[PDB]
């Protein structure tokens, strides 16, 4: 199944933050409106916050996360969770190798802000 | 129900990161084995990261998040999500006021690392 | 925090299913737009499906689960999870006593149907 | 990523329930320690419960859900959610066709029981 694609409420600010846990340098692309809106990158085996940004979900609300390691696309896993019918998290894990920890880049999207 | 309490595997490193979305200055305390192991504070209305740290679950694996504003405990909401049977997120939201957005401090715990 | 309340898309069909795990008879009421739309009662300590029904979220999309034992409301825990940006679960646990297993009645809402 | 595989605590009872939402008969296999422990078959486009059973996770704790239609493996999506650090749900969706609703057979695993 497609992973890493989330429908947010339209025209709504959201936070996006990326963590790294791999020997490989991670590159995280965040697409809004099917166009790159943010790119994060780094290399850590200790959960470094390689990037964090506030974005707007735009007219469609479609947000997509993609991860690559030296130009090679990582496999993704994702889900969305809603607490008290108000607080949203869209979660992505990615795997760049064979150990299937899916933590090589971890991405968290949260909304609402403010 | 109690919220913000998680059982991790023993002696396991985990990431904890906090974001603020409030006029109130947030204090986030992360307890491991019922003792404060990390404290973060900050104030933002725009999802600023107010702390990130890697901790060890220790012998107990008992992790608890507490949030306060002006000496008063915030009301918490929380859940744990597991993706592809491997990637764990422990998620916390907190409410310091009356609008029930539950994003006043947002805490994300993730493991495994590395 | 309020628990057991979910906003579904308006005019959407959804399933609701209740399980019991208690010495006490569970009464599960499912409200749509604040009016009772389905009720299930039963006693099980072996996860019997005390009822399942299909409903429509109607104009409001507001769906609420209540659980009581002999007229006393149980404490509720809940969350909503979305898989592959399409498949939704709204999850409820309830505690009618002191052991905090939160399984005394378990209620699962799923959509879309068909 | 692998989907539909869950690690439960060893030697623990769990509930498994399957719903159908497809014009084709669904066949759901539940494997414990890589061996068939339950099979459910049924057809509904209205969320009928096609099977429900209580199983034991046994010595391995390894539970896997597979779904096939008319012989052919359906694509799966899954996750596990824990509420109040006590109540577990393992959730599976499956897609047998072209619409990507992932509700063709829906499987819900819950523990603990009793
Ligand atoms: C009602 C819809 O049912 C769809 N499933 C099928 O159409 C399906 C399942 C197996 C077969 C089937 C078998 C044998 C030969 C053929 C070819 N005619 C086809 O068709 C679901 O995917 C969809 O979401 C909807 O619920
Ligand atoms: Ca890896
Ligand atoms: Ca890794
Ligand atoms: Ca607030
Ligand atoms: Ca706020
Ligand atoms: Ca109980
Ligand atoms: Ca019970
Ligand atoms: Ca389908
Ligand atoms: Ca279907």
Residue numbers in the entry:
A (entry chain B), B (entry chain A), C (entry chain C), D (entry chain D): 1 to 114
Paper text:
In this study, we evaluate the potential of synthetic fucosylamides as inhibitors of the two lectins LecB (P. aeruginosa) and BC2L-C-Nt (B. cenocepacia). LecB folds as a nine stranded antiparallel β-sandwich with a Greek key motif and two β-sheets composed of four and five strands, respectively. BC2L-C is a hexamer that displays a double sugar specificity: the LecB-like calcium-dependent C-terminal dimeric domain is specific for heptose/mannose, while the N-terminal trimeric domain BC2L-C-Nt is l-fucose-specific and binds histo-blood group oligosaccharides, such as the H-type 1 antigen.
Co-crystals of LecB with the dual ligands 2 and 9 were obtained with a resolution of 1.55 and 1.74 Å, respectively. Both complexes were solved in the P21 space group with very similar unit cell, and one tetramer was observed in the asymmetric unit. In protomer D, the fucose moiety coordinates to the calcium ions inside the carbohydrate binding site for other fucoside/LecB complexes. The anomeric amide nitrogen forms direct hydrogen bonds with Ser22 and Asp96, while its oxygen makes water-mediated interactions with Ser23 and Thr98. The orientation of the furan ring allows for hydrophobic interactions with Gly24 and Val69. The phenyl ring conformation is imposed from the crystal contacts: it is stacked between the side chain of Asn70 from one symmetric protomer and the main chain of the β strand containing Ser41 from another symmetric protomer on the other side. The terminal benzylamine of 2 displays a direct H-bond and a water-mediated interaction with the main chain oxygen of Ser41 and Val69 from this last symmetrical protomer. In solution, the aglycone ring could adopt other conformations and stack on the LecB surface to optimize the interactions in particular of the amine.
